[PDB]
Every structure is written in structure tokens, then in C-alpha cells.
Amino acid sequence: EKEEAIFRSAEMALVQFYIPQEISRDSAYTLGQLGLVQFRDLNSKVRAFQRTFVNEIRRLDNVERQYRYFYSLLKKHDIKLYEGDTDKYLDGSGELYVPPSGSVIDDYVRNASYLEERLIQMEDATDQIEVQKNDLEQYRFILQSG
Amino acid sequence: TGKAWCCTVLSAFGVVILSVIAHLFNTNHESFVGSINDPEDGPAVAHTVYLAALVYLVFFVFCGFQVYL
Amino acid sequence: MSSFYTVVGVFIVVSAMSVLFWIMAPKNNQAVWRSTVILTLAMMFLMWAITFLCQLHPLVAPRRSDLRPEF
Amino acid sequence: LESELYAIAKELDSWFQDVTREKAIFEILNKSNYDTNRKILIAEGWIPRDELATLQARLGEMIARLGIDVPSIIQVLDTNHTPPTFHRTNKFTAGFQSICDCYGIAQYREINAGLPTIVTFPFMFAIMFGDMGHGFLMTLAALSLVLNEKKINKMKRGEIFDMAFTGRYIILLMGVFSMYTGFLYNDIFSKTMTIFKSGWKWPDHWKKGESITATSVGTYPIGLDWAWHGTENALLFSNSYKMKLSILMGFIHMTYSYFFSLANHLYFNSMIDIIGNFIPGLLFMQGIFGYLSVCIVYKWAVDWVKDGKPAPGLLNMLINMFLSPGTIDDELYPHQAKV
Amino acid sequence: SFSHFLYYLVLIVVIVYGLYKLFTGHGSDINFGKFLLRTSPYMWANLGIALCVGLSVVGAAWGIFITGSSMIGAGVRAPRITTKNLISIIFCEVVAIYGLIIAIVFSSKLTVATAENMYSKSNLYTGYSLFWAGITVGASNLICGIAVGITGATAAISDAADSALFVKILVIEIFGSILGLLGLIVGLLMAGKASEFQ
């Protein structure tokens, strides 16, 4: 059957997951694919600055920081982000998604770090001589009407 | 574009409101010529409202071809 | 036939249709149908009865000095 | 830089999101208790009871892909915390549920006030807006946004235009019910409708500039009789009408909202509030405004002219019963001062 | 200043005009009596019915922006107080309902009176009573509406610091609302005897 839950709320109890360490990641993706569960923080009694998997997430947000700077370089220059038309091919619906392996993701954090350093070099070269462009390009303008 | 929809929908209902108005002065409806302040002659008015209603049918068909293309 | 019983005549017809629709409504989004219609008919009814009772035995009548003598 | 930037840009959008998940997964795994001596991760969460079985059936398929097949990773208990609130919503009920949510999140397993809000809200708009001509226009702009909703969903939109599309079903009803009212008010673009016979009647003969008064014949069935338009004393009728409408329409909307209190105390099994909170307020206002609402109907179904009695006033009736009780100026019915 | 210079001058014309009519033997011509006997008793009653609801509603809306404008201030760092300090908005409104009741009580007494029995004893009393009943009830509630608002912003602050201070302050704000109830009483004892116009 199916409860409608428009005259009253939906009746619901809480449920535990004794998750293994081997598949700690791989089982948790599936809930995110499913999208019906809300968790309760028992770890809130412990402080927020020191937690278990901070060494992991702290590494990733710095890696996710850098991707916004890749998009920023697209903004300045005459380029468009070639985008997808729909979101039906990323397993957002009921269909499942096998999670990536560590080698897929270890390459990403690696690809974030060595890639930008090439881009930080090329933009310094441009800016080192682009400031030379405007200082002289103005110097001729006063001469044209001299 | 939007500049034509304005004169389209306006001219559309303008034809439909004015056509019904003309039919009532002709037939001497109480609410429209029953009082003294209202005009005395009915069909002398309906002959004026047909003509004005055509003017909106001009802009309905004219700008009706423009939105089509 | 114009009297307070006429209101009562329609209060029964509408308080019967309100019961048959409680029964015959489809299961799919059933409280949507069930509460929408019954709650609507009453507020359509109340505004008809009140508009009707105020005309049965009025205390003031229309008065004007504007009509043409031809009417 | 640009041929490289062009090369990175095509790849970027795909594996942008794929890392955002991978960090979010560990945000919710922090909140579990990670025991060191024993490899057990304890995470507890809420799940609607309808989809226990989907979760049970779906979990079993993952562990077959793995070959581990732990003895059990699922168990439910009852506790005394506050569970959250979730109402299921389709395209229709959502624009009406977005309104009741803004004022307050409803307690667990009480009445949602979003079902009566589907009809009371746009119908009260009709009482004020109240015209067939304007209400017709609101419907069409709501009859356009609705039909083409699949085109409009994909394309981008402004912000003034999103709220219209988010509430395209709110505006539909306000235009429909505005046409049913104006047929009773008998207004269309400030003009009237002359379909049925008028129960009023004029004299047989008069002259120009000479005042006249009407004679009643019968009753006008559906709405305001069209003889009032253009008249001198019209507003002495509508004003004394529309007041008594809104009082009765306010006495009904409130009490209907007030018996939802009763249908909640009977759920959580709290009987003291029925005898403590509900009933005393029921006996207070029903004994004042229920007496005011019922007398107004009695005054209308009584021909005070034929009987020869004067029609009593209702303001002096409500006042003297507090100040000078047991006293009357004009009688309404037997044993009035007794009640 | 200019607006303060007039007030010294209106006093001076009244004193020249008060003597010129006196040293010449015309002092009885400035007769406030005839100004009270010949003026229509309906004017004095329709002012006490509009000033009662007039000066009362000014009281309520005054106390609301002293109250609300500070509740919104404290609720930038402590937004939990908006539902606990709502009470002070109720005691500012109720005085308006005290006024709206009197105006309906006195409107019952406005009737039509003949031309011969207009300026009689029972009709001059009524107008003069319905007038000073509207000033008393409209001035008392005008001030109760201000002493509650002021007192309502101090509790809206102390609640934000520590919640233990709130209930201890309503004993002040409840003694502020008594004042609006005492004019409501005295305003009626005046008009308890006055009979409608004949």
C-alpha cells in the first residue's frame, strides 16, 4: 500500500546501519542514489573541529576550490562552458550508479593539483606583458593628437 | 514579439466588447438608453461602433501575420 | 414558490451529493478530490442562500427619479 | 593557454559533480560512531514506513554484488525524540503548501492546513475581487501558463515570471470563482445581467423628473435582482447585505478551523484539553456570535410588515444584553430575555 | 522663534479685546452661555465619538513602533524572541478595542429630535456628557498606549540577554494597562444616566 500523507504527516521510525569498513563508502552512495533518508548526529556531542574523516574531506574542498578557479578563467576570456542538455544520464533517477574506484578519484585530486600550476604559469606570463601592453598603448594615444 | 501581442489581444477583445455594445443600443436595452442622461438615439450609435470595431479587426489580422512569421 | 423551505429544499440535495462523492471518489489522490469538492459546494451554497434570504421580505424598496416615461 | 583551456573546459563539467558527491558521502559518515577496536559504524536515520520494504529489498542486492552478506545491517526501535514532518506533494498541491510552510512547520502527525487552503484562499479573493469581467481575464493568463507548461519548464525565466509559473494553479481558481460571484453580485465591467424576471415592478405611469418607487411581486432566484442598478438607494441594500454575509462567512470559517483542535486531541489521546481548552472557548463565542449569526437569519425569514410588529435592531440587542440585561426595546422572539 | 512668537501675540489680542469691551460697558456681550445654549448638541456628541476612537487608535499605533522596532533589532542575533515578546503588541492593541466599544455604545444614543424640544434640559446634558466622555477615554488610552510601548522595548531587550528577566517586567507593563481600563469605566458612569435625544 501507500500512505498519502496530505491530511497528516507520514508515520516513520528511525533505523540503524551497522556499516562495514570495507564497504563504508560503497553502501553510503546507494542511499544518496535513493534519496529517502535523514540522519541524526550523535557525533555533535563531540567538538566540530576534530573529527574522524577530517583528513579526507579537508583535502577535497581544497580540490573543489580549484575547480571554481578553472571556471573563473573561462569567464575572463571569450569562452563558453560547453554544458549538458539534461541530467538523465548521471543516474539521478531510481536507476543505480556503481561508485567510482579509488584510482578514478585519486587521479582527480592529482589532476587538480598539477594541472592548475601550468595555468598559473601561463597567466603570469600574459599578465607580465599585458601590463606592458596598456602602459605603451596609452603612450601612443597622447602622441597621435600631439 | 511582445510588441504585437499587445495590440493583438487588445484588438481581439476590443472587437468582442464593441460588437456586443452595438447590438444593445440598436435593440434599446434599458441599462444603456433607459435613463435620461444616456443618448436618446440607439441605431445612431451602433452605426458608429461597427466602424470602430472594424479598426481593431484591421490590427488583429495585420499583426496576426507578423507573429505568424 | 419562494420561501425559507426552498433553501431547505437545496440543503438536502447538496447534503446528499456531498455523501455520494465521499463514496464514489477515485483512490488516486483521494483526499484531494474528497475535501476539495465538498468544501467548495458549501461555500457556493452559502453565498446563494444568503443572497436569497435578503430578498424575501425586504424593508426598503428601490427608488429613483431617472427613468424615461416610455420604459 | 586557450587551446588548453578549451580542452579542459569540455572535460570539466562532467567530473565537476562526481567529486561533490564523494565529499558529501564522508560528511554524513562523520556523524556515525566509528569504533576502533571493533569495525562497526553506527548511523541512525529516519525513513518513511512505506519504503522500509524498498530499502530492505534494495540493500540485499548490493551485498550480493560484494559477496560479504553481513548477518544484518538493519533494525528499527521506538524512541522519544521528535520525528520530522513530511507531506507528499504533486504539482497542484505544492503552490498551496508553500504558503502554509512559510508561517510554521507543522507538528508531527497533526492536521495539515494546506487542504482547506486550496479553496478558502481563492474563494475569499472572489468575494473582494467579485466581478465576472475581470475574473475572466485572470483565468486566461492562467489558462496559458498551464497548457504550455512543458515548454516553459525547460527554458530559462526571470524572477517575477517564476512566481507566476509556481502558482499557475492558484491563479486559475481565483479567475474561475470570480466569475461565479459576479453572477450573484450581478456585475460585469460595472454593468448588469438581465436574464431572469425581476420580482420587483414599477408603476403603470409616471413623468419626467418625477420620483417613483417599486412594488414587489416575487423573489429573484439567483443573485441580486437587476432592478437595483442605477437606483438611488442601492448602497443602502448592498452595504446592509455584504456586512451580514462576511459575519456569517467568518463565523463558519473559524469554527470549522476550530474542530480540527478536537480531531487532534483525540489522536494523541489528550482528553484534559478537551475539557480544559476546547469546550470553554466553544461555549464562549458560540454563545455570543452564534447567537448573533442565528438571529440575523431569523430576521430575514420574518415578514415584520404583515404582522404589524417593528423589526428590532441587532446592535441594541447585542449591547443591552451586557449592560442592562433582562431588558428589550423591540422583541425578536418569545423568551428572548430568558436566553 | 516664529511659531513661539504667535503664542505671545494671541494672548495680547484677547487682552486688548477683553478690555475694550469692558471699559466701554459691553462685558456681558462676551457670553459663553449663549455659545453653549444655542450651539447644536449634535456637534458635541459627534466629536466625542470620533476622538474616542480617534485618540485611542493613535495610542495603539504609537506603542507598536516603539515596541516592534526594537524587537526586530534584538532579533538579528537572537531571533527566538519574536513569539515570546508578542504579548506587548497585544496590550497596545486592546486599548483600541476599548475605544471601538464606546463609540458603538454612544452611537446608539444618536437619534433625531424635534425643532422645539432640541435645546431642552435632557438634550444639552447628553451632548455635554458624550463629549467629555470621548475626551477622557481618548486621552487615557492615548497615554496607556505609550507607557506600554516604552515598557515593551525594555523587556524585548532583557529577554535577548537572559530570559529570566522577561516575566519580572510584565508586572510593570500590566500596571501600565490598568490605566486604559479606568477611563473605560469612568467614561460610562458619565453616560450611564444620559438618555438618547428626543
UniProtKB/Swiss-Prot annotation, chain A:
Coiled-coil regions listed in the entry: 115-143
Top-rank taxon: Eukaryota
Post-translational modification note: Glycosylated.
Family: Belongs to the V-ATPase 116 kDa subunit family.
Further facts: Present with 55714 molecules/cell in log phase SD medium.
Subunit structure: V-ATPase is a heteromultimeric enzyme composed of a peripheral catalytic V1 complex (components A to H) attached to an integral membrane V0 proton pore complex (components: a, c, c', c'', d, e, f and VOA1).
Entry protein name: V-type proton ATPase subunit a, vacuolar isoform
Organism listed in the record: Saccharomyces cerevisiae (strain ATCC 204508 / S288c)
Classification lineage: Eukaryota, Fungi, Dikarya, Ascomycota, Saccharomycotina
Gene name of the encoded protein: VPH1
Residues shown, of full length: 3 to 148 of 840
Swiss-Prot record, chain B:
Membrane topology qualifier: Multi-pass membrane protein
Keywords for this protein: Endoplasmic reticulum, Membrane, Transmembrane, Transmembrane helix, Vacuole
Signal peptide interval: none
GO CC annotation: endoplasmic reticulum membrane; fungal-type vacuole membrane; Golgi membrane; proton-transporting V-type ATPase complex; vacuolar proton-transporting V-type ATPase complex; vacuolar proton-transporting V-type ATPase, V0 domain
Predominant location category: endoplasmic reticulum
Location of the protein in the cell: Endoplasmic reticulum membrane; Vacuole membrane
Membrane spanning residue stretches: 5-25, 49-69
GO molecular function, one term: RNA endonuclease activity
Record keyword Phosphoprotein present: no
Membrane side Cytoplasmic: residue ranges: 26-48
One GO term of the biological process aspect: endosomal lumen acidification
Function: Accessory component of the V0 complex of vacuolar(H+)-ATPase (V-ATPase), a multisubunit enzyme composed of a peripheral complex (V1) that hydrolyzes ATP and a membrane integral complex (V0) that translocates protons. V-ATPase is responsible for acidifying and maintaining the pH of intracellular compartments.
UniProt subunit comment: V-ATPase is a heteromultimeric enzyme composed of a peripheral catalytic V1 complex (components A to H) attached to an integral membrane V0 proton pore complex (components: a, c, c', c'', d, e, f and VOA1).
Name assigned to this protein: V-type proton ATPase subunit f
Organism whose genome encodes this protein: Saccharomyces cerevisiae (strain ATCC 204508 / S288c)
Covered residues, full protein: 7 to 75 of 85
Swiss-Prot record, chain C:
GO terms for biological process, alphabetical: cell wall mannoprotein biosynthetic process; endosomal lumen acidification; Golgi lumen acidification; protein-containing complex assembly; proton transmembrane transport; transmembrane transport; vacuolar acidification
Ranges that cross the membrane: 4-24, 36-56
Lineage of the species this protein comes from: Eukaryota, Fungi, Dikarya, Ascomycota, Saccharomycotina
Keyword Transport: yes
Organism of derivation: Saccharomyces cerevisiae (strain ATCC 204508 / S288c)
Primary localization: membrane
InterPro entries, A to Z: ATPase_V0-cplx_e1/e2_su
Keyword Transmembrane helix carried by entry: yes
Gene Ontology CC entries for this record: fungal-type vacuole membrane; Golgi membrane; proton-transporting V-type ATPase complex; vacuolar proton-transporting V-type ATPase complex; vacuolar proton-transporting V-type ATPase, V0 domain
Record's protein name: V-type proton ATPase subunit e
Pfam family name, one: ATP_synt_H
UniProtKB/Swiss-Prot annotation, chain E:
Keywords for this protein: Hydrogen ion transport, Ion transport, Membrane, Transmembrane, Transmembrane helix, Transport, Vacuole
Single GO BP term: vacuolar acidification
Organism: Saccharomyces cerevisiae (strain ATCC 204508 / S288c)
Family: Belongs to the V-ATPase proteolipid subunit family.
Annotated effect of mutating E93D: Partial inactivation
Feature type site, description Essential for proton translocation: E93
Subcellular location per the Swiss-Prot or TrEMBL entry: Vacuole membrane
Recorded GO MF terms: P-type proton-exporting transporter activity; proton-transporting ATPase activity, rotational mechanism
Quaternary context: V-ATPase is a heteromultimeric enzyme composed of a peripheral catalytic V1 complex (components A to H) attached to an integral membrane V0 proton pore complex (components: a, c, c', c'', d, e, f and VOA1). The decameric c-ring forms the proton-conducting pore, and is composed of eight proteolipid subunits c, one subunit c' and one subunit c''.
Reported function: Proton-conducting pore forming subunit of the V0 complex of vacuolar(H+)-ATPase (V-ATPase), a multisubunit enzyme composed of a peripheral complex (V1) that hydrolyzes ATP and a membrane integral complex (V0) that translocates protons. V-ATPase is responsible for acidifying and maintaining the pH of intracellular compartments.
Name assigned to this protein: V-type proton ATPase subunit c''
Cytoplasmic topological domain: 21-46, 107-129, 190-198
Pfam family, one: ATP-synt_C
Topological domain spans for side Vacuolar: 68-85, 151-168
Annotated membrane topology: Multi-pass membrane protein
Segments passing through the bilayer: 1-20, 47-67, 86-106, 130-150, 169-189
Classification via Gene3D superfamilies: lithium bound rotor ring of v- atpase
